[PDB]
């Protein structure tokens, strides 16, 4: 289905601390008020969704059913790929070739170790009576791989009306060609969401502690364009100038007068007799 | 040496000084870089090749060399950009009855390519009759055994060789040198370098709340104001050592 991502998907673009200032960054973000793909689970769904640029994965999960993610473009041992899982109190991010099955499950069934190339171990990313929100921004840039995270309580299904930044949980410089991702979980009433990040220019309001407290998009609506032009949140009454209305070209034209001279190649190639 | 092992090394800082601080590694022939210089240098991947040879065949582990080891067992390319480490080990690698756990390829139809490994034991058909897998006239087993003995000659005494190759090619560096954290001088004006962040000014003690993942601190005009101490997760303000316009 479709839902509304009102104001969600704001991650710290830089490890640079600030205070009480506003910083008009311009990076790959998830635009405000976007129709995001909604799923939920006898009935289920598990396609192979394309990892176009960046996915604001959200999971209003009652009790930690989602079990990792799988990324890549082929996922059949032909191309180097990766697997991220969430063990009871640990996680593993490996980079191997893999061969999967239609219904891998536990009480798994796939080639976990094949032509491997990278491994990772850490604490359980999915910490743990509320359907705790588990936002994760998955993105790759310049041959690096970035993830973000957040863990907030949820009372009782649609995204809340609130703003929460996302710390950079873990970085990992893998740098492989990726196109399509697939989520992983186990059933034996949980929703997983997939947005799509797009190049965009944002305003962010760092608080007195370097923590983000509010954000404004430049390209959303005229008033937001003013806000992003004055570099301020409140806008005093007036008439401001923000940008330049410009029309774009439509098609392509090439011109040249009628051509009359053709090189006499036939007389050489189709000659009746060649010289010695 | 014919079945040389290769240990790929990554996700780690290599203290080269440790092995450089050991006389037994007498033979430390490197080519293309300086050991001391690379201890502040970084690479994407490192490969550690180890094998055992005789006393005098250490020269064969070198670019542009020839011989049984160089042509059939372990060939280095002409454009070698790494180090060679070799030492004598008569105690462990040798035995009183002679060691039979060692083999060197003696016959092969064609010289190896650089860093090629060959573990196939197929009779070297030197003549024109097929061998069918049994040794005989013009049919030789590819490998033979070194008779390492305690009383053997130095040129025949055992020798362990470790070859390090460095390839930082289009890959996020995973191996750098452990440049020791140098001293920190506070309240006296200095020139500083903090994890690739190298300005000039006086270091001081800070009190500004810093989020743990945050590293730097920028003021209005993107000036590096606060810097996380790399070892201890504390914060050092950088306000230029006290100054104020001089008028006479």
């Amino acid at each position: 289905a479709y839902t509304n991502s009102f104001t969600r998907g704001v991650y710290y673009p830089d490890k640079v601390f600030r205070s009480s200032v506003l910083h008009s960054t311009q990076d790959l973000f998830l635009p405000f008020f976007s129709n995001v793909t909604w799923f939920h689970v006898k009935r289920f769904d598990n396609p192979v969704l394309p990892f176009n640029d960046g996915v604001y994965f959200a999971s209003i999960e009652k009790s930690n059913i989602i079990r990792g993610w799988i990324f890549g473009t082929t996922l059949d041992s032909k191309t180097q790929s990766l697997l991220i899982v969430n063990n009871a109190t640990n996680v593993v991010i490996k980079v191997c070739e893999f061969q999967f099955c239609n219904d891998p499950f536990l009480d798994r069934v796939y080639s976990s170790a094949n032509n491997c190339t990278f491994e990772y171990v850490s604490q359980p990313f999915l910490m743990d009576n509320f359907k705790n929100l588990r936002e994760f921004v998955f993105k790759n840039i310049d041959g690096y791989f970035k993830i973000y995270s957040k863990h907030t309580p949820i009372i009782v299904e649609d995204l809340p009306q609130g703003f929460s930044a996302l710390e950079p949980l873990v970085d990992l410089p893998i740098g492989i060609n990726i196109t399509r991702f697939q989520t992983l979980l186990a059933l034996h009433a949980a929703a997983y969401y997939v947005g799509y990040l797009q190049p965009r220019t944002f305003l962010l309001k760092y608080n007195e502690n370097g923590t983000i407290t509010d954000a404004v998009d430049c390209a959303l609506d005229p008033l937001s364009e003013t806000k992003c032009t004055l570099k301020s949140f409140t806008v005093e009454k007036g008439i401001y100038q923000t940008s330049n209305f410009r029309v774009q070209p439509t098609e392509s034209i090439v011109r040249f007068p009628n051509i009359t001279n053709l090189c006499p190649f036939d007389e050489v190639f189709n000659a009746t007799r060649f010289a010695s | 040496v014919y079945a040389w092992n290769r240990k790929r090394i990554s996700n780690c800082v290599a203290d080269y000084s440790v092995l450089y601080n050991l006389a037994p590694f007498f033979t430390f022939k490197c080519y293309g870089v300086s050991p001391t210089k690379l201890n502040d240098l970084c690479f994407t991947n490192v490969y550690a090749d180890s094998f055992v040879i005789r006393g005098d065949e250490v020269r064969q582990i070198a670019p542009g060399q020839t011989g049984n080891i160089a042509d059939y067992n372990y060939k280095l390319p002409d454009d070698f950009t790494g180090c060679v480490i070799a030492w004598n080990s008569n105690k462990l690698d040798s035995k009183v009855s002679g060691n039979y756990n060692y083999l060197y390829r003696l016959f092969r139809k064609s010289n190896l390519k650089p860093f090629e490994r060959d573990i196939s034991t197929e009779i070297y058909q030197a003549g024109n009759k097929p061998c069918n897998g049994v040794a005989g006239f013009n049919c030789y087993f590819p490998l033979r055994s070194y008779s390492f003995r305690p009383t053997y000659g130095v040129g025949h005494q055992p020798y362990r060789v470790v070859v390090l190759s460095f390839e930082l090619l289009h890959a996020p560096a995973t191996v750098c040198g452990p440049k020791k954290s140098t001293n920190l001088v506070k309240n006296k004006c200095v020139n500083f370098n903090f994890n690739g962040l190298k300005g000039t000014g006086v270091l001081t003690e800070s009190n500004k709340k810093f989020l743990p993942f945050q590293q730097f601190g920028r003021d209005i005009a993107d000036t590096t104001d606060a810097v996380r101490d790399p070892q201890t997760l504390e914060i050092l303000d950088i306000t230029p050592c006290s100054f104020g316009g001089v008028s006479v």
């Epitope: 976990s112 170790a113 | 079945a3 092992n5 240990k7 180890s50 756990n101």
Partner: antibody, heavy 127, light 111 residues
Framework: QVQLLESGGGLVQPGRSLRLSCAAS????????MHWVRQAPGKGLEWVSG????????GYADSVKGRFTISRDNAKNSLYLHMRSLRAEDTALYYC????????????????????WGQGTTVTVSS | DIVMTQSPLSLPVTPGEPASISCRSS???????????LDWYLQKPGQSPQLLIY???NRASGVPDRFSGSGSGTDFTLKISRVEAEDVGVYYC?????????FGPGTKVDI
Amino acid sequence: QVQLLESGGGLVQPGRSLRLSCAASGFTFDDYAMHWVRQAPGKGLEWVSGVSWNSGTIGYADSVKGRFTISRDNAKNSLYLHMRSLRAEDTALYYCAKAVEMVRGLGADPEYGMDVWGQGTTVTVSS
Amino acid sequence: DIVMTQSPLSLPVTPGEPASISCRSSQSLLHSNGYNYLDWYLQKPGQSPQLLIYLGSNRASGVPDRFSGSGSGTDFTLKISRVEAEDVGVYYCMQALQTPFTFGPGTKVDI
């Protein structure tokens, strides 16, 4: 699950060669010392050969020394056992076993603890 | 080049009682670390053998706590605190100090 598959059995005349192959799947190949152990028909076990984590062999049986040749390949997770000078007294099963202690996990490096065993082949010799 | 022996050669055990088997060597297996390198293995008839005890007395993983290993120097003992109907087969002791390794002749336990 950890898997040890061996192949290479078959009737061969005396005075020939063979090459058994053992394939490992389900663990990091370079942190376990592999072993080759025979099993004669209706008799006890008998150690044959072994290999450390760094592809360094650790000697062969006293009565077989001179013909057998072991080799390792961590890239393909493949262990091989070239066999020479085949005689009628070499007919037996052959398991490839694995060590238990991972290297550098605690004095010296471990070589004991043959815990996991694949189903051996049925190499035989006769004329 | 070390030769080991076991005793008794073959002993009948009945389910519900302890049993004791001794493995003896020629050279003491005490290493510089002080650890014994003898290991106990059970090769059930018709099935691939299994590990029972490694490093002298350190219990192997996944086996019940009904087995006990003791001894040092040149004499080691394996005691099954309680025997049942699934404790029949052949037992061996294998050295792990001086290469090449060896396996004892074997004790045959039955009902």
